[PDB]
Design a protein around this motif. Structure first.
Motif, PDB file in Angstrom:
ATOM      1  N   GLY A  47       0.795  -1.212   0.000  1.00 14.16           N
ATOM      2  CA  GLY A  47       0.000   0.000   0.000  1.00 14.16           C
ATOM      3  C   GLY A  47       0.831   1.267   0.000  1.00 14.16           C
ATOM      4  N   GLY A  48       0.270   2.343   0.541  1.00 15.51           N
ATOM      5  CA  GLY A  48       0.976   3.613   0.556  1.00 15.51           C
ATOM      6  C   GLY A  48       0.842   4.315  -0.776  1.00 15.51           C
TER       7      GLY A  48
ATOM      8  N   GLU B 184     -15.457 -11.146   6.276  1.00 15.54           N
ATOM      9  CA  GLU B 184     -15.312 -10.196   7.377  1.00 15.54           C
ATOM     10  C   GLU B 184     -14.380  -9.051   6.998  1.00 15.54           C
ATOM     11  N   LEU B 185     -13.284  -9.369   6.301  1.00 15.53           N
ATOM     12  CA  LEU B 185     -12.364  -8.337   5.835  1.00 15.53           C
ATOM     13  C   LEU B 185     -13.061  -7.372   4.885  1.00 15.53           C
ATOM     14  N   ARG B 186     -13.874  -7.898   3.965  1.00 13.75           N
ATOM     15  CA  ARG B 186     -14.597  -7.036   3.037  1.00 13.75           C
ATOM     16  C   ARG B 186     -15.603  -6.161   3.769  1.00 13.75           C
TER      17      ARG B 186
ATOM     18  N   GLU C  53     -15.394  -5.054   6.974  1.00 11.92           N
ATOM     19  CA  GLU C  53     -14.657  -3.995   7.663  1.00 11.92           C
ATOM     20  C   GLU C  53     -14.066  -2.989   6.679  1.00 11.92           C
ATOM     21  N   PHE C  54     -13.628  -3.457   5.509  1.00  9.04           N
ATOM     22  CA  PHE C  54     -13.055  -2.555   4.518  1.00  9.04           C
ATOM     23  C   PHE C  54     -14.118  -1.639   3.928  1.00  9.04           C
ATOM     24  N   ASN C  55     -15.316  -2.169   3.684  1.00  8.80           N
ATOM     25  CA  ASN C  55     -16.411  -1.329   3.216  1.00  8.80           C
ATOM     26  C   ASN C  55     -16.808  -0.313   4.275  1.00  8.80           C
TER      27      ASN C  55
ATOM     28  N   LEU D  48     -14.817   0.976   6.482  1.00 10.09           N
ATOM     29  CA  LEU D  48     -13.763   1.981   6.560  1.00 10.09           C
ATOM     30  C   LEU D  48     -13.823   2.930   5.368  1.00 10.09           C
ATOM     31  N   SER D  49     -14.037   2.394   4.165  1.00  5.30           N
ATOM     32  CA  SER D  49     -14.179   3.243   2.987  1.00  5.30           C
ATOM     33  C   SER D  49     -15.402   4.147   3.110  1.00  5.30           C
ATOM     34  N   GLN D  50     -16.482   3.631   3.701  1.00  2.00           N
ATOM     35  CA  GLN D  50     -17.669   4.441   3.945  1.00  2.00           C
ATOM     36  C   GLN D  50     -17.360   5.587   4.896  1.00  2.00           C
TER      37      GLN D  50
ATOM     38  N   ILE E 292     -14.496   6.936   5.415  1.00  2.00           N
ATOM     39  CA  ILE E 292     -13.575   7.870   4.770  1.00  2.00           C
ATOM     40  C   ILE E 292     -14.330   8.776   3.803  1.00  2.00           C
ATOM     41  N   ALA E 293     -15.138   8.187   2.918  1.00  2.66           N
ATOM     42  CA  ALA E 293     -15.881   8.999   1.963  1.00  2.66           C
ATOM     43  C   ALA E 293     -16.928   9.864   2.656  1.00  2.66           C
ATOM     44  N   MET E 294     -17.400   9.455   3.836  1.00  4.21           N
ATOM     45  CA  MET E 294     -18.282  10.316   4.614  1.00  4.21           C
ATOM     46  C   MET E 294     -17.513  11.499   5.188  1.00  4.21           C
TER      47      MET E 294
ATOM     48  N   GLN F 250     -14.996  12.828   3.742  1.00  4.54           N
ATOM     49  CA  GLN F 250     -14.767  13.720   2.609  1.00  4.54           C
ATOM     50  C   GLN F 250     -16.049  14.411   2.172  1.00  4.54           C
TER      51      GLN F 250
ATOM     52  N   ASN G  94      -5.318  -0.969  -2.222  1.00  4.90           N
ATOM     53  CA  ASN G  94      -4.208  -0.164  -2.716  1.00  4.90           C
ATOM     54  C   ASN G  94      -4.695   1.192  -3.204  1.00  4.90           C
TER      55      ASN G  94
ATOM     56  N   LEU H 280      -7.384   2.759  -2.086  1.00  3.23           N
ATOM     57  CA  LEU H 280      -7.771   3.516  -0.899  1.00  3.23           C
ATOM     58  C   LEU H 280      -6.546   4.038  -0.158  1.00  3.23           C
ATOM     59  N   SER H 281      -5.500   3.217  -0.049  1.00  2.91           N
ATOM     60  CA  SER H 281      -4.278   3.659   0.613  1.00  2.91           C
ATOM     61  C   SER H 281      -3.590   4.756  -0.185  1.00  2.91           C
TER      62      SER H 281
ATOM     63  N   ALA I 102      -2.882   8.376   1.304  1.00  2.47           N
ATOM     64  CA  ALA I 102      -1.519   8.891   1.341  1.00  2.47           C
ATOM     65  C   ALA I 102      -1.406  10.207   0.582  1.00  2.47           C
TER      66      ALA I 102
ATOM     67  N   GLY J 227     -16.263   2.466  -1.139  1.00  3.11           N
ATOM     68  CA  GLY J 227     -16.894   3.736  -1.434  1.00  3.11           C
ATOM     69  C   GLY J 227     -17.996   4.047  -0.446  1.00  3.11           C
TER      70      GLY J 227
ATOM     71  N   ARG K 178      -4.221  -8.329   5.928  1.00  2.00           N
ATOM     72  CA  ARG K 178      -4.831  -7.984   7.207  1.00  2.00           C
ATOM     73  C   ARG K 178      -3.916  -7.095   8.034  1.00  2.00           C
TER      74      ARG K 178
ATOM     75  N   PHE L 248      -3.988  -3.667   6.513  1.00  2.00           N
ATOM     76  CA  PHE L 248      -5.291  -3.062   6.769  1.00  2.00           C
ATOM     77  C   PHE L 248      -5.399  -2.590   8.211  1.00  2.00           C
TER      78      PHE L 248
END
Lengths: 275, 275, 275
Positions: free
Chosen positions: A38-39, A253-255, A257-259, A261-263, A265-267, A269, B259, B261-262, B266, C39, C255, C258
């Motif tokens: 990442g990064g 579960e990862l998907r 939590e990732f959704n 987190l993206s939610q 973040i976009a909130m 923004q 990637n 999102l990161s 960043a 998103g 993980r 993340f």
């Protein structure tokens, strides 16, 4: 004797030891796994091999024969290149290369009579010809700056011992013939352009095929297997796999939590873009 | 009568019924799967088991015998512990514990003659001795504050029924022998330090091995299998697996999304560092 | 004659050819994989099928028989629906549908004698009756806005050829019977509500079970298998799988990355609550 013989060396009531001596056209293919950290995009996590299936259909002497091949690698060497600890230097944590100490496995299977009920095999041996596997050109797509390209790499695969194996897949399971290959390093070397690395033998694990559809090598194999005397018996080939349900659950579960987190973040923004 | 005999209780034109009565040293091992939820680091998703392979090579009475073992658990109990609904309270949504109601499965295999073409077996039985398994010391790495440690737990494994099974892997597939084990609680109980929980029996799933390279239990097994009279046939052992390709694809899409999102995060963190 | 026969059409020293003719209750089940893109929550990356295991126990004519059935689909078509390029329009990158060109596979297994050592089969046939499969109501959980509901869809499953297969799982490995089904679209169509799509046929991949516990179809099968004359031999069934360790490793690196990113985000959000 025909090039595609089939002979009986013993026959009891229900079983029979059938000898087979047949020519084959192994058309296989590597497959690479590229995991990018990442990064910003300046650090890559792994550049490794993945066992790769390839099913084709070729022409025998007046017959059409469907096949199924599966290439894999063992004993590869793990190199790495780190030019700096900052987020803006190009780094590759671990990438795989093939040399003498490694081996290339190729499981092979056909729709012919030899592989219909093969579970037992003796007197196994094969005459295979040697080929040359040449790597291609992988352009590391950095976010900004220059674009290093891992280009080159040649290595000659030579015939070696033969064994049995099982090709497992999400559709078919095949009791298959395992051809081994050893490696002798060739003259074309692989080098990361626009970088301080070059003139090192081996093959790169980013684009081994070199934009090819497959690597072709012809061979002959000779074995003796146990086949029921009645030529109507069938051994299960197809599959319906539901393995690694725990992994599927972890991924779900990862998907989730990732959704979430993206939610979030976009909130953040949207509130920071709702004036 | 020897300890590692080999008898032929019948013989037909091709096949043969052979009896095998052999001693074994099952050197098995557990393996734990920890999963840490996102946020700050006080919330844990799951702490569970995973089928755990361990291959090795031990000395018989003048023979060097290569072996291969695979442990697993079933019917484990899913306990939980939630100190609250806050981001800063230590919570473990689910962790697995072994008790009487659960069972432990151990698949075993060797390079001897008993296993080379074992697909049919009868008169299977074994006389195993019981052992003790004690839990480890797993220090939960918290971002800030004290460091809770899961420490304790002891359960005795008692022998039970014996059957067959299959140890699939990414390298080999083995037609193996399945020893079953039941459980009885013992005096050492597991508990999390700096927490209002203690004096509850079972074995944790955070670190069952107690740092031991393996758990060892001796045994003997007697059975009768169908093998070809010609001791040159070989059943397929090795594999080249490409199972869960849809899962591989989902993981690739998730990596792409994470990637991107990161990279967004960043860039939004770096735009504020240009003054 | 009998409805659950077991005949001996031949016999030798150790092996034998047995003919089994039995009635069965194929109780199978569909399963969906709903992946939701990141998103805001208006964009769905894929809605696919997954092979679905279901194990049960049903009553034969005075016998209590345990069974295991695994459903799968093949040749399913991929439809898509985009309402706009914005983050706030309801888009489904891909959802899977079943139609005539596709096929439905059902692997079936019981604990009866016909399957205890079945590795070879001939003269395999089957008489199956048709059933109806209908879609439920999958309400897409949109964070804000209206609530699209994918509803409807009915298809008639007509019998087709029978073959062999192998059901692999994280617990058991079953040499099973593969019933194949062809499809004809029915009158009830599938439609997403509050959306400009309707009067198109097939089966939704969202809720194919219609809130049911299973789809039951009766059947009968007849075969001729090779079995050891001694009716005590047992073939390996149970498993302990450790497949895709490299995939588990990639998921673990994912993980960790993340969790690090989530910790960074949460510290950034927590630093702004100190007044």
């Amino acid at each position: 004797a025909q090039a595609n013989e089939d002979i009986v060396v013993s026959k009891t009531s229900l079983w029979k030891e059938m000898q087979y001596n047949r020519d084959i056209t192994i058309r296989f293919k590597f497959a690479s796994s590229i995991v990018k950290s990442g990064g910003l995009g300046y650090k890559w996590s792994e550049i490794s091999f993945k066992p790769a299936n390839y099913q084709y259909t070729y022409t025998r002497d007046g017959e059409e024969v469907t096949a199924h091949t599966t290439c894999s690698v063992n004993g590869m060497n793990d190199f790495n290149f780190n030019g700096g600890s900052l987020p803006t230097d190009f780094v590759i944590s671990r990438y795989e290369v093939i040399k003498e100490n490694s081996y290339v496995y190729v499981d092979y299977w056909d729709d012919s009579q030899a592989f219909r009920n093969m579970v037992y095999v003796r007197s196994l041996a094969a005459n295979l010809n040697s080929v040359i596997c040449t790597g291609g050109d992988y352009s590391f797509a950095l976010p900004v700056g220059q674009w290093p390209v891992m280009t080159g790499g040649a290595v000659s695969l030579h015939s070696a011992g033969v064994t049995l194996s099982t090709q497992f897949t999400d559709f078919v399971s095949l009791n298959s013939l395992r051809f081994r290959f050893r490696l002798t390093v060739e003259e074309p070397s692989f080098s990361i352009t626009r970088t301080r690395v070059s003139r090192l033998y081996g093959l790169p694990a980013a684009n081994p095929n070199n934009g090819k559809e497959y690597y072709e090598v012809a061979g002959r194999f000779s074995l003796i297997s146990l086949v029921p005397s009645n030529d109507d018996y069938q051994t299960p080939i197809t599959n319906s796999v539901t393995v690694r349900q725990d992994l599927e659950r972890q991924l779900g579960e990862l998907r989730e939590e990732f959704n979430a987190l993206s939610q979030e973040i976009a909130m953040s923004q949207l509130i920071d873009l709702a004036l």
